[PDB]
Amino acid sequence: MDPSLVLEQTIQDVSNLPSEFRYLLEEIGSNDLKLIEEKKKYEQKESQIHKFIRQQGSIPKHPQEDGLDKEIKESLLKCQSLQREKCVLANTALFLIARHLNKLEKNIALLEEDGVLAPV
Amino acid sequence: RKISVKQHLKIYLPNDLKHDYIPTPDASMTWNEYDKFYTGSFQETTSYIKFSATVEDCCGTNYNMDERDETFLNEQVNKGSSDILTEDEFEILCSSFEHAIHERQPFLSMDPESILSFEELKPTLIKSDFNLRNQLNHEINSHKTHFITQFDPVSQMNTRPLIQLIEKFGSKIYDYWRERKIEVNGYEIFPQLKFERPGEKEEIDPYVCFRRREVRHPRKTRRIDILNSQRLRALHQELKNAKDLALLVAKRENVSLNWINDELKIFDQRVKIKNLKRSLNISGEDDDLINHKRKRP
Amino acid sequence: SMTQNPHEVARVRNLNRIIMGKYEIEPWYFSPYPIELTDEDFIYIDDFTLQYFGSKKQYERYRKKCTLRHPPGNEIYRDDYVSFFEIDGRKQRTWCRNLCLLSKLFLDHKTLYYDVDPFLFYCMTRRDELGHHLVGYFSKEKESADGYNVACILTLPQYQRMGYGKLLIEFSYELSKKENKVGSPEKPLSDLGLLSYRAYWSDTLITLLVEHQKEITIDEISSMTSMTTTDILHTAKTLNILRYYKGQHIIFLNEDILDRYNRLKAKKRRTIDPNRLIWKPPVFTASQLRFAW
């Protein structure tokens, strides 16, 4: 048990992590642009139904209600798929740093069970 | 020249030559089942790949069913059972059996016949990165289903957890796994690489690979390494601030997923109410069928 | 695990036939795969993790669970033809071992005595709908004192005769130029590799000498190509560039040489584009230049 050995080991294990976080986060932001543009593609089509309801109500049917609903539902699920990908990306970044943190914390615990590790 | 016969021998080339002469591998035939084994898609990203996970991180379960494991699953455990045992689930049990025996009976080969019984092992099977995956799922406040990363195939989601697989199938599978360990005399069931034991040096055996002869010795002092412990503590802090932000981002996308899962549900509810409203001729009732405008920075 | 049978029979056998990915290859030399595998009809090599299998059933179960689809490391070069991944043997122990076991089947002088810790593995891949497919690699000592910019180099047999070996060599010298270091392949080269290196040496030399116009010196050639003066002078002797005519040394670019120069210029050989190399040389400290503990 050696603090300089655990430090050397932890440094190498997290060396490419800052590069990985950029690669992951910028892949999230690239999908948030894709998500936002797909939001307009249904927030507009959602505005068509609501304007018709704001004036006439729900009992009257919009001229193309069946047509827009299929286009809204299609555009919404595409946004769902795009959001899930952002979660997966964000979770791996969390998973990576959390796992290294847990390994380091186990080493710090073992260094403290011997006399080798100084207090904070 | 041509047609001078003084033993002109022809050679066909199952072993090629290229132009000293140079031997050349012949063209490689293709494999028929390739399309059955290699199924999926890898999307190229705009920027160059950054990656540092190991093969172990990307393989899932340690155990892999062989042909004999396959016949035993179909023709014994799943022959006419009301409850069927998934291949992925069969490996989850065996993967836990191997890990348990490796920890409790590391010197099994000394006395293979005395391998632990299933009842003797069941306590240790219970205590058996599942914990970290669940801890993260709570910290994200997802609290739904499984924690999904890039290292997870979607087919592992339909697999039962280990603690219940012990009760349903544990005794039947372990008795079969136990016999395999007995046949191999407590050694490893499947082919392993041949490694040199630490502190020993082997030179004759051709199958010994990847020797590691370096050795680190402790410093001749009992003093505390103040310097390398401050910097270890400093790095531990920066990894904690690291995890705090990564957690927030994973929280942010999780609520962003709940929000859209709501929108997709609110939509499917508004259209069902409208189709229901027109069948009953009920008027008014449009407050919750249209989006209103509130404050958002 | 120290779990090894002492009464296990150790007999040297080459593998009958390997199936790496979609292609069926025949090994040329011995490689210390597990002894049980050495007596099997077919050996299955995963095309992403390089994992070895004797049971087709396990290979099936492995693929269904394996999520990796490219060399476990950073992408440091990508054009529309190939990609290059940089892999540390100390970080990717299992993978680099699987690569070395695989490589040893087709390299006669490659050694597996020590572990893969001291090496950097530069792997050339061909991207696909399934992912990046390894076609060849070259290993490199982390900090070679001998100035070797390539330890072992190999193009996998099922991707032979497609210009890959010339891309490996070119990339190896591209790294040397970015490193501001001169380099030479490790001395024992296979017959196939020595041919490929002499082609690269003669091609890049005639191209440099013709377009140079101005008087050049041996040391300046080395600075532009990261070739050693020894490799340069030997290539000048393989050609007849170097003449001593009337009391002085001169460089002679005859017509037969300029014919190959023009054939080279018209041909559309695949080349390495230095601007698509996004890569800073690894910096190792004294503790990192050791075996892991």
Add this chain to the structure above:
Amino acid sequence: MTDELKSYEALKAELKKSLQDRREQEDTFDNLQQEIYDKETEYFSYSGNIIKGFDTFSSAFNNNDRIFSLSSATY
């Protein structure tokens, strides 16, 4: 046919609740990004980060280095 009227009473209440859930999600989302932005400032302004790198034992924090905030198109 009263079952069809009860389905209407059930779906309305379910839509009462999902709208309330949507607002809560919208509301917690706005807090997180500010928290993300604030934590970027508290932590990044031995000197190792995920922004710069960890191996310091041998330039400033521009708003272009707020990689966590810049992962949301809303910011």
